[PDB]
């Protein structure tokens, strides 16, 4: 439940910061707060799931078409 | 209920010594009528899923049960968003 959520929660929270690096990220290729709104939301995350979202940012910074 | 009937077992436990809740709980009841062989009813209680699940909480210990959705699954609702593309050292995005 609410323990259960707890984990759920990080996970909502790394669902929360999910869409906002994105939609920074979204916007970038066509072409700001979509992106602080992930950092803010990954300011107060857990640790192995912040960690992996690092890991996914960092991945974003080495990605392309193929990647894509 | 040991030969599998537990369709009249439950009938006459609904409103008899101990009860059904009761023996969710405990089972030293000292009358002898609220109690029953315990595999042959459990196993003879194959049609009982649902049943089983509400009569007698699951007895699991305190790691986390199945949780059916993963970050790349549930993300993958939207639509090229499912983090299988990559991130393959997490099992969570499964």
Redesign the interface.
């Given at each position: 439940e609410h323990l259960?959520q707890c984990?759920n929660l990080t996970?909502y929270q790394?669902?929360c910061a999910?869409k906002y690096a994105?939609y920074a990220l979204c916007v970038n290729s066509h072409q700001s707060t979509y992106l602080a709104r992930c950092q803010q939301y990954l300011c107060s995350i857990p640790d192995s799931l912040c960690l992996?979202l690092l890991?996914?940012i960092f991945?974003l910074l080495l990605?392309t078409s193929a990647?894509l | 209920l040991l030969e599998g009937h537990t369709l009249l077992a439950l009938a006459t436990t609904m409103y008899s010594p101990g009860g059904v809740s009761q023996v969710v709980q405990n089972e030293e009841n000292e009358n002898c009528l609220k109690k029953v062989d315990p595999q042959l009813l459990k196993m003879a209680l194959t049609p009982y899923p649902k049943l089983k699940t509400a009569l007698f909480p699951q007895c699991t210990p305190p790691s986390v049960l199945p949780s059916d959705i993963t970050i790349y699954h549930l993300i993958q609702s939207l639509s090229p968003f499912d983090p299988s593309r990559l991130f393959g050292w997490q099992s969570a995005n499964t």
């Open positions: 259960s984990q996970l790394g669902f999910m994105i992996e890991e996914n991945s990605i990647d | -």
